[PDB]
């Protein structure tokens, strides 16, 4: 890979939503507008791009934080992840991917993803303590094992890496990333990862219960 690769030291923040649920509106704001601001609003990401389908292209530009880009993304995910990248200018040294529905998502966790990156992780995500108790399960229901709960954690976005590294684990892993976290296809290649402490507003905003919680959260 090329020696460039990095070398303008900057955050690059990508958005993949390429549709409903990131569209979906809280409170008369968007998911990812509230979630591209939270990103902007962090103080401390160089570039926010967002992936989107196409008819939502001119949309997404006229209704998110100015300082925010949209390109059109790809089907393959990583190919969203790509085309954004090749709208960034230079060469960022860090690439945080960040989910839409986790709209809201406190500023101080995304900084405190970045910060880790400074210190010298070169793959760190967002995480919590479990509520429950996780059992491995079969397909008919019956329980195959209980693993150490207090040994588990829950992962939130964004999820930060160094460029290369990230690029990396694409070329091996791509081919199953919309079932994986990025930070899974990482480890696969050998990857190091860091937890720093999530939020508990850092949800992942998917039924009718989550929205009803993140409106209620918002007219406070």
């Known amino acids: 890979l090329a020696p460039e690769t990095g070398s303008s030291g900057t955050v690059a923040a990508v958005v993949p939503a390429a549709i409903p649920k990131a569209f979906c509106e809280i409170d008369g ?11 902007l609003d962090s103080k401390v990401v160089d ?25 059109a993304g790809g089907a393959d995910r990583t190919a969203s992840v790509r085309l954004a990248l090749a709208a960034v200018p230079g060469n960022p040294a860090f690439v945080l991917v960040h989910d839409a529905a986790r709209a809201l998502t406190p500023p101080a966790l995304i900084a405190r993803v970045v910060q880790a990156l400074r210190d010298g992780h070169r793959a760190v995500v967002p995480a919590l303590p479990l509520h429950d108790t996780v059992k491995a399960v079969d397909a008919n229901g019956v329980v195959l094992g209980t693993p150490e709960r207090d040994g588990l954690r829950a992962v939130q976005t964004p999820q930060g890496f160094a460029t290369d590294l990230l690029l990396r684990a694409y070329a091996a892993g791509a081919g199953t990333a919309g079932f994986t976290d990025d930070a899974s296809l990482v480890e696969h290649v050998g990857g190091q990862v860091q937890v720093v402490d999530g939020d508990p507003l850092a949800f992942k905003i998917t039924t009718q219960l989550d929205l009803l919680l993140a409106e209620t959260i918002v007219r406070r």
């Open 29 to 39: 704001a968007s998911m990812l507008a509230r979630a591209v601001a939270g990103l």
């Open 47 to 71: 570039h926010v791009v967002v992936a989107v389908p196409a008819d939502r292209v001119d949309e997404a530009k006229r209704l998110l934080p100015g300082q925010a880009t949209v390109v």
